[PDB]
PDB file of C-alpha atoms in Angstrom:
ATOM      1  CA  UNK A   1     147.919 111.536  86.975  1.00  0.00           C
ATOM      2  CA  UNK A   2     147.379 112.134  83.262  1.00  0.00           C
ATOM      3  CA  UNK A   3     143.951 113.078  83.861  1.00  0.00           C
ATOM      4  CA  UNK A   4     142.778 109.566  83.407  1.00  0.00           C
ATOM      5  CA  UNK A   5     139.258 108.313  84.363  1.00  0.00           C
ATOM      6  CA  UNK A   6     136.146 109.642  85.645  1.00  0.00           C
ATOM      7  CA  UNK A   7     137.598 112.382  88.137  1.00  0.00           C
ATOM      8  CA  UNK A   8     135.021 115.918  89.180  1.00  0.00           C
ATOM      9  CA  UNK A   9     136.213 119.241  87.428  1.00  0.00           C
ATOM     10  CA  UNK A  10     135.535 122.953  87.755  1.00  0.00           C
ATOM     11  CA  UNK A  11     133.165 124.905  85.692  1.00  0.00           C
ATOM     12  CA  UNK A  12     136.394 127.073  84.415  1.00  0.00           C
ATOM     13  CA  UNK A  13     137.804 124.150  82.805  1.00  0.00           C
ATOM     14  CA  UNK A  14     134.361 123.098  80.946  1.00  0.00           C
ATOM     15  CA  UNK A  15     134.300 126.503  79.220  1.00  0.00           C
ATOM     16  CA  UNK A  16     138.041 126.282  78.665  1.00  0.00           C
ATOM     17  CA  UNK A  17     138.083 122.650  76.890  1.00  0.00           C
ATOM     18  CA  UNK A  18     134.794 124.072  74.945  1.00  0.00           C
ATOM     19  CA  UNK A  19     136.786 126.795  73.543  1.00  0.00           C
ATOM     20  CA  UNK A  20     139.868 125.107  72.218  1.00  0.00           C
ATOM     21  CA  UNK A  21     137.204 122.362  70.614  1.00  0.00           C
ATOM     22  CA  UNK A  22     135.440 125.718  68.569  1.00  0.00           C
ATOM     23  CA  UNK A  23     138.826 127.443  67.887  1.00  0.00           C
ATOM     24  CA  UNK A  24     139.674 124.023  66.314  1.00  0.00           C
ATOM     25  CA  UNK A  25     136.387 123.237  64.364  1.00  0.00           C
ATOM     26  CA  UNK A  26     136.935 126.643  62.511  1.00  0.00           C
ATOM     27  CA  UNK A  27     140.339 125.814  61.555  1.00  0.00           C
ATOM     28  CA  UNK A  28     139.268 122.511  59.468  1.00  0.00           C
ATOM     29  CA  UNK A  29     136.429 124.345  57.796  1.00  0.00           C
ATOM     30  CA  UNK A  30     138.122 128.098  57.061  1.00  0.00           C
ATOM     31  CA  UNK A  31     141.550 127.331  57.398  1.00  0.00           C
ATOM     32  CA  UNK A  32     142.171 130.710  59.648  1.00  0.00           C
ATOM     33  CA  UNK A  33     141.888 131.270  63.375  1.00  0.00           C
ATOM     34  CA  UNK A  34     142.327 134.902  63.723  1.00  0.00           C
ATOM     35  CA  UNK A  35     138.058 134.590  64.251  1.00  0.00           C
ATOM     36  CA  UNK A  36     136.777 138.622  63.939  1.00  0.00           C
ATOM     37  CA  UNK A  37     133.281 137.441  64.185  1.00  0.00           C
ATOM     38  CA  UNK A  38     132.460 133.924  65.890  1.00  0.00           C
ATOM     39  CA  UNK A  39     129.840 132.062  62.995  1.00  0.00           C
ATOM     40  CA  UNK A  40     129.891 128.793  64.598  1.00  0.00           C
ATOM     41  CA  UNK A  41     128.306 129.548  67.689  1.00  0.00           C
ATOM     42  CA  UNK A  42     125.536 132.256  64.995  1.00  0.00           C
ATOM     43  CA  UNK A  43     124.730 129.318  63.582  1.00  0.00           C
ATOM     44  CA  UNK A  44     124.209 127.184  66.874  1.00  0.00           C
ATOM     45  CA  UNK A  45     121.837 129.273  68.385  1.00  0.00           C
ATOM     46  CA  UNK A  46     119.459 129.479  65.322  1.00  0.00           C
ATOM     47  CA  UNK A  47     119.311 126.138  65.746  1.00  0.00           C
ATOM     48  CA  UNK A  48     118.437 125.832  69.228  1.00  0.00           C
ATOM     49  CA  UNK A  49     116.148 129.176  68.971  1.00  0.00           C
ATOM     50  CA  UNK A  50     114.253 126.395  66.323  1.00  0.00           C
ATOM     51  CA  UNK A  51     113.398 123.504  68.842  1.00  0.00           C
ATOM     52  CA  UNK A  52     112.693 125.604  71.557  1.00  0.00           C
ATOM     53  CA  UNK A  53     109.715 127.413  69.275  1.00  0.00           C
ATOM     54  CA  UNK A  54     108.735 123.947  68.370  1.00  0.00           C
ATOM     55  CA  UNK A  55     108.386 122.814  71.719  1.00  0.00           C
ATOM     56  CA  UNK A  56     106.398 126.262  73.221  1.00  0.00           C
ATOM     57  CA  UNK A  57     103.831 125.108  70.358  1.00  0.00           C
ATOM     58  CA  UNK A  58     103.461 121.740  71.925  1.00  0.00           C
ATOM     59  CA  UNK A  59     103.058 123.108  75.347  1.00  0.00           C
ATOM     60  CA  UNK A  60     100.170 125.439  74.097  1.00  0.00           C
ATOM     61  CA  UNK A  61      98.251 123.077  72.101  1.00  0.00           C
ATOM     62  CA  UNK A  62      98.914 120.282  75.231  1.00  0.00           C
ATOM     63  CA  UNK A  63      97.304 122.950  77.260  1.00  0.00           C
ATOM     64  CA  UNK A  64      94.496 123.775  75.026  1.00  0.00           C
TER      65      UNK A  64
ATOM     66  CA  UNK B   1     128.523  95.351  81.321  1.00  0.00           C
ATOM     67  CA  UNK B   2     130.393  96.211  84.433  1.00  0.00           C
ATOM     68  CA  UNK B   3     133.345  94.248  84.008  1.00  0.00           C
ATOM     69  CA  UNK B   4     133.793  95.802  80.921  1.00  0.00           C
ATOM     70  CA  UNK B   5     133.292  99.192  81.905  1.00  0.00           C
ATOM     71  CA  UNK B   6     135.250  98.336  85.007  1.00  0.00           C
ATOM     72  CA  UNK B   7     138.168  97.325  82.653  1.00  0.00           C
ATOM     73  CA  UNK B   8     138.197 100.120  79.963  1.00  0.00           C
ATOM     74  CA  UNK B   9     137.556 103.394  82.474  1.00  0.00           C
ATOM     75  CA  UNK B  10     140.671 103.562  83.963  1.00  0.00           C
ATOM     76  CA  UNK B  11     143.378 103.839  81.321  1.00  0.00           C
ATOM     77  CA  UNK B  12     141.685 105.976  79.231  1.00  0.00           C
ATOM     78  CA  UNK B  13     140.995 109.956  78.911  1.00  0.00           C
ATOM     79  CA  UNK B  14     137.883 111.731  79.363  1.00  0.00           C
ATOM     80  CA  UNK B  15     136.966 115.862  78.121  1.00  0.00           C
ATOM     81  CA  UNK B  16     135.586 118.173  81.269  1.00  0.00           C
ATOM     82  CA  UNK B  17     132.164 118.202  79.535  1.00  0.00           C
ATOM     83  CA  UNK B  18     131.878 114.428  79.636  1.00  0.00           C
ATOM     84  CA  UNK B  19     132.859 114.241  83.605  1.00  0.00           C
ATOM     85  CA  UNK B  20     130.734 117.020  84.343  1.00  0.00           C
ATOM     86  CA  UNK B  21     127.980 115.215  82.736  1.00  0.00           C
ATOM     87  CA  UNK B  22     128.304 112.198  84.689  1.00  0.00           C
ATOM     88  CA  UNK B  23     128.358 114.225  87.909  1.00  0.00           C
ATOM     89  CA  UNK B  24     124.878 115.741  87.510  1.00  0.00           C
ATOM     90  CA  UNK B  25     123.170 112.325  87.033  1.00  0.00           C
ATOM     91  CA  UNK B  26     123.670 111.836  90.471  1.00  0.00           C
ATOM     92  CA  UNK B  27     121.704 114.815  91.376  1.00  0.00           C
ATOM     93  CA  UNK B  28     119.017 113.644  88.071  1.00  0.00           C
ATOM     94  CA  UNK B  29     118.233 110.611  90.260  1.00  0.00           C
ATOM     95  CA  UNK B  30     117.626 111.662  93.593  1.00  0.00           C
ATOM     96  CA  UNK B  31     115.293 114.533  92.697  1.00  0.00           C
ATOM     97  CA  UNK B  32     112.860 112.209  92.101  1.00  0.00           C
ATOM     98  CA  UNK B  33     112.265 109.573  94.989  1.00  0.00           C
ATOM     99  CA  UNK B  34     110.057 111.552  96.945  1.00  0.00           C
ATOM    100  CA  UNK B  35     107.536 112.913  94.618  1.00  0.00           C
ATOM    101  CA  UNK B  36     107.291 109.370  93.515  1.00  0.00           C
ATOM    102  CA  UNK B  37     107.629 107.812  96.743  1.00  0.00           C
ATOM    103  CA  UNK B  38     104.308 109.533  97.462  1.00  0.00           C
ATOM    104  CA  UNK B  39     102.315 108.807  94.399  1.00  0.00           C
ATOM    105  CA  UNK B  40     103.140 105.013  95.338  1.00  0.00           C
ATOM    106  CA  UNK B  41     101.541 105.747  98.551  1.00  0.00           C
ATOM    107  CA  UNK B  42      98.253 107.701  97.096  1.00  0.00           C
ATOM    108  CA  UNK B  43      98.879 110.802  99.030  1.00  0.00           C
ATOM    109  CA  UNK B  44      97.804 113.083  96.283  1.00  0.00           C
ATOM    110  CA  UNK B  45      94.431 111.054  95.441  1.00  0.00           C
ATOM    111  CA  UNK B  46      94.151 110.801  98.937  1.00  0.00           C
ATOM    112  CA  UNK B  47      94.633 114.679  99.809  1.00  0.00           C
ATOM    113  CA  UNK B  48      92.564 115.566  96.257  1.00  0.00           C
ATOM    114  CA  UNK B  49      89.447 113.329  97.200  1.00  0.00           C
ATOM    115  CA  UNK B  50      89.666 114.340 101.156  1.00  0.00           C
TER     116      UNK B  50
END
């Protein structure tokens, strides 16, 4: 019980415990949760839309 | 390294992302063996230089 150790779980409860974790980050930074427009997640993506452009480089000068 | 993971792991908590991610190294492993397997036995040289 109590959840405790290393036990399987459903793909519904990954996105659930991933949503409580960004409603909670925004409250420590903007002190709100009412969240009209989601930044955090903006912000993530830029990110990741950085290192994958990086990478396609690599591929094309490995293959050249 | 064992005994202390065998120690610690079962009174504490762990998030679904974390136990999800343990899951799939399972699957990380196996993919492998037989594609290696293979190279270890020169089947593509072999096949390549008929």
């Amino acid at each position: 019980g109590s959840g405790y150790g290393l036990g399987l779980s459903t793909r519904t409860q990954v996105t659930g415990y991933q949503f409580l974790a960004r409603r909670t980050a925004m409250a420590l930074t903007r002190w709100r949760v009412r969240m009209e427009i989601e930044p955090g997640r903006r912000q993530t993506l830029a990110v990741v839309a950085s290192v994958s452009a990086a990478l396609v480089i690599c591929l094309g000068a490995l293959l050249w | 390294a064992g005994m202390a993971a065998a120690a610690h792991v079962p009174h504490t908590i762990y998030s679904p992302l974390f136990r999800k991610f343990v899951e799939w190294i399972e699957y990380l492993c196996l993919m492998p063996i037989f594609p290696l397997a293979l190279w270890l036995m020169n089947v593509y040289a072999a096949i390549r230089y008929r």
